Write a protein that binds this ligand. Structure first.
Ligand SMILES: CNC(=O)C1(N2C[C@]3(CCN(c4cncc5ccccc45)C3=O)c3cc(Cl)ccc3C2=O)CC1
Ligand SMILES: CNC(=O)C1(N2C[C@]3(CCN(c4cncc5ccccc45)C3=O)c3cc(Cl)ccc3C2=O)CC1
Ligand SMILES: [Cl-]
Lengths: 306, 305
């Protein structure tokens, strides 16, 4: 019993974190095999950030201008290249702690663990979701760039995020491990803003199923709804549209609890209209949207507390 | 910017988790140097759990009855002994991944990271607090016993909790690494319950300071209070009493924000009496009490390990 915001054990990622320095700029790097991946803005000064010409800044750099530090050991940079917004530094030593890994690009609504790092040293681990507006509500200070997001399903680490910047509303933007940004963001200090965010409906439904599994049913009602009528209500509360894909995805949780997806949608419609009236669901007074259907299945018991 | 429930990086603890099997019972063990620590109930059958005489159950076991597995390698048990509610299995190999460590017993209100494990394999990491009623609001299933709680102080892992059981309300009970339970619990299948819980006042105040540091200031007011008047109100709402030690502990956060501790206490009094009126603090409609003053300072400064 219990339901917590749970991160993957971070050890496999801790053994990959290094410090990358170019002149006066220092940030974090991810060392996998003989390559160190890091944000390309490590070659920029604060003045370059308004309209940087990365190709022009990079061509003036040699391998020996990049200082990579792994623990207390200096790695030797033997090559460099840029791939989108990421810099790939070829080093003379393969990481002996390199886990089994893949680079995966995630979709909005998907969750991941973040290992926040400073100066190549891990400081903390927390759970995050890719918001529908392609930002993440992380906890990062100056020096955290190059910190990564990942999932570890079945002992293989799937790296999905590298941290690049904080927007004016305090939310965060970054790229996949191929340097492609999530959202319409650029690694430029030009005026940028997070778009209006919405609630991840499929995740709130998954979390309502987690509460039924753990033994709570107070929020259920005798009603059902159509998918279209549910979406007309959801969008009035700034909730993302629920698609047939989301309904299909919620199938296993629906079978385990015996509550049809559109019946759970009717409960969600009622919760949005009435609020909680002093009650909580899994220790929360707000409807949680940062647990996916997959996260609920992973954490919750396979036996519903009927 | 941003404020998340953050755990310590778990790698140093991951390298210590092993699987311990005694007959049909399998649970987790902590392998430090040449000793594997685990809950002593690993030696009980379901019937034994009703009224166990652990010394009598243990005397009937030999070293080979304990199967310890580290990854895909079997560890050879060369000795065994009991210390309170923990079983210490002496093995023939010292853990090459043993970090610098200490066993520490924590007080209610203190937070720690839990590395939830099943079959000796880590599955997740989360942050939680020792409740004033000595239980923890964890997330554990059958097979999680022997999972540990810890904090990191520079390079040293301070182990503070080992998981033993789940109470009827779904909350959890366990021991320090010396086998002494937190709370009036026993490792027996008998009628036991979590007592009435209270809110950790010093932690709520720390989290209000974290919110101010992050730009959430709507709850601040021109008023102040005395410590005694605040405690009379806090008692009415099932909040733990605030002591002069708690006030001293909140000093740095008070200096950084310019909001005196008793000034923040007046803000907390108004929130208890009136609620939030449709507003949230750090994305929460409830007053959060699982962040200590130290956790707030650490997350708002980026302390590394
Ligand atoms: C909040 N940002 C800023 O004040 C500044 N900034 C800097 C930066 C790099 C570091 N960094 C941060 C990343 N995460 C958290 C942070 C917290 C507090 C300060 C900075 C942080 C950035 O955002 C950056 C990178 C890129 Cl690719 C594009 C633009 C910027 C940028 O705007 C200084 C001007
Ligand atoms: C909820 N518990 C139970 O139904 C049972 N139980 C078993 C147990 C050992 C495992 N375990 C659990 C530990 N954390 C989470 C759990 C989730 C779901 C089932 C069990 C869990 C226990 O509590 C145990 C240990 C001790 Cl030292 C004292 C008594 C018990 C005990 O009562 C079965 C009867
Ligand atoms: Cl995805």
């Amino acid at each position: 019993s219990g339901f917590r915001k749970m991160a993957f054990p971070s050890g496999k990622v801790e053994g990959c974190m290094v410090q990358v320095t170019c002149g006066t700029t220092t940030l974090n790097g991810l060392w996998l095999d003989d390559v160190v991946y890091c944000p390309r803005h490590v070659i920029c000064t604060s003045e370059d950030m308004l309209n940087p010409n990365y190709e022009d800044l990079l061509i003036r750099k040699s391998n020996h201008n990049f200082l990579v530090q792994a623990g207390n050991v200096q790695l030797r940079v033997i090559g460099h290249s840029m791939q989108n917004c990421v810099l790939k530094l070829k080093v003379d030593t393969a990481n002996p702690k390199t886990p089994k890994y893949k680079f995966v690009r995630i979709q909005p609504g998907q969750t991941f663990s973040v290992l926040a790092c400073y100066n190549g040293s891990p400081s903390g681990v927390y759970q995050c979701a890719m918001r529908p507006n392609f930002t993440i509500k992380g906890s990062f200070l100056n020096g955290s760039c190059g910190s990564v997001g990942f999932n570890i399903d079945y002992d293989c680490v799937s790296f999905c995020y590298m941290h690049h910047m904080e927007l004016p509303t305090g939310v965060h933007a970054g790229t996949d491990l191929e340097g492609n940004f999530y959202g319409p963001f650029v690694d430029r200090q030009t005026a940028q803003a997070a778009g209006t965010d919405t609630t991840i409906t499929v995740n709130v439904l998954a979390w309502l199923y987690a509460a039924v599994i753990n033994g709570d049913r107070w929020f259920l009602n005798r009603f059902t709804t159509t998918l279209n009528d549910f979406n007309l209500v959801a969008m009035k509360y700034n909730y993302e549209p629920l698609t047939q894909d989301h309904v299909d995805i919620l199938g296993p949780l629906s079978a385990q609890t015996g509550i049809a997806v559109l019946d759970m949608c009717a409960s969600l419609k009622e919760l949005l209209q009435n609020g909680m009236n002093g009650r909580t669901i899994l220790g929360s007074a707000l409807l949680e949207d940062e647990f996916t259907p997959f996260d609920v299945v992973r954490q919750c018991s396979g036996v519903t507390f009927q």
